[PDB]
Design a protein around this ligand. Structure first.
Ligand SMILES: CC(=O)N[C@@H]1[C@@H](O)[C@H](O[C@@H]2O[C@H](CO)[C@@H](O[C@@H]3O[C@H](CO)[C@@H](O[C@@H]4O[C@H](CO)[C@@H](O[C@@H]5O[C@H](CO)[C@@H](O[C@@H]6O[C@H](CO)[C@@H](O)[C@H](O)[C@H]6NC(C)=O)[C@H](O)[C@H]5NC(C)=O)[C@H](O)[C@H]4NC(C)=O)[C@H](O)[C@H]3NC(C)=O)[C@H](O)[C@H]2NC(C)=O)[C@@H](CO)O[C@H]1O
Ligand SMILES: CC(=O)N[C@@H]1[C@@H](O)[C@H](O[C@@H]2O[C@H](CO)[C@@H](O[C@@H]3O[C@H](CO)[C@@H](O[C@@H]4O[C@H](CO)[C@@H](O[C@@H]5O[C@H](CO)[C@@H](O[C@@H]6O[C@H](CO)[C@@H](O)[C@H](O)[C@H]6NC(C)=O)[C@H](O)[C@H]5NC(C)=O)[C@H](O)[C@H]4NC(C)=O)[C@H](O)[C@H]3NC(C)=O)[C@H](O)[C@H]2NC(C)=O)[C@@H](CO)O[C@H]1O
Ligand SMILES: [Cl-]
Ligand SMILES: [Cl-]
Lengths: 79, 77
């Protein structure tokens, strides 16, 4: 019913435990991200909207998966 | 008995959620720090050693609590 980008294999493999695990862009906003909370053993998860600190924007790049300065973020709104 | 700098009142008041919360120096190493992971909802946490990026050292100063250039860090050495 709600938007839910939590990929099951990512949920099963990482258990969303590590510092970059199960973190996804929020389509509505560049200053938040979505973090998945596992609900069971088969990869289902509850998506949770999480805030970036003041001034920062989600950086979805491989190896990043963190809030970053806007000029380094993956916000689709640029220039 | 093993070393645990995680103070329960800080775990309780912050839930170790914020960007500077429940972060402590690692006495054994200037290139790592200790982060507290809560084990319950009533203040108990375990200490996890976390790495600084290569070449950086822990800065325990007030308002910092982050990995920093060596000349800015609080390393006792
Ligand atoms: C009892 C029990 O076990 N219960 C289980 C429970 O634990 C499980 O829940 C999971 O718990 C774990 C453990 O608490 C949670 O793990 C945490 O996850 C968050 C992310 O969600 C991690 O947060 C990241 O933290 C890293 C640092 O460790 C941050 O890295 C920093 O990023 C900044 C930029 O944002 C970098 O900044 C740059 O720095 C350079 C200089 O170095 C500077 O030049 C630049 O200017 C600067 N850029 C900017 C913009 O300032 C910085 O370098 C870097 N720091 C370092 C040291 O590299 C990163 O930003 C954080 N990311 C986000 C997002 O916040 C956190 O580390 C991690 N904790 C631990 C202890 O590892 C996990 O989230 C949680 N999962 C869930 C789903 O809740 C649950 C579920 O599995 O099960 C219970 O049973
Ligand atoms: C589903 C759910 O709810 N799960 C819960 C789970 O989320 C909870 O876990 C907690 O999650 C949160 C995120 O949600 C984690 O929060 C993160 O915490 C980390 C620290 O642990 C924060 O990391 C810092 O990030 C900032 C960027 O925002 C970094 O700041 C930069 O630091 C550099 C120095 O390293 C600064 O550069 C220096 O600047 C000075 C001054 O100008 C200059 O003099 C120096 O030369 C310069 N030095 C260098 C080397 O460049 C830079 O200015 C600054 N940037 C800015 C913009 O201020 C900082 O380095 C990072 N620190 C460390 C350490 O990595 C991170 O920001 C924060 N994320 C967010 C989104 O807030 C939290 O860690 C995690 N807790 C735990 C215990 O895992 C859990 C538990 O509560 O519960 C679940 O239920
Ligand atoms: Cl935004
Ligand atoms: Cl903001």
């Amino acid at each position: 019913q709600p938007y839910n980008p939590c990929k099951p294999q990512e949920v099963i493999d990482t258990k969303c435990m590590g510092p970059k695990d199960c973190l996804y862009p929020n389509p509505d906003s560049c200053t938040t991200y979505i973090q998945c909370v596992p609900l069971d053993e088969v990869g289902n998860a509850k998506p949770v909207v999480k805030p970036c600190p003041k001034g920062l924007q989600w950086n979805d790049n491989v190896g990043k998966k963190w809030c970053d300065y806007p000029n380094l973020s993956t916000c689709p709104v640029k220039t």
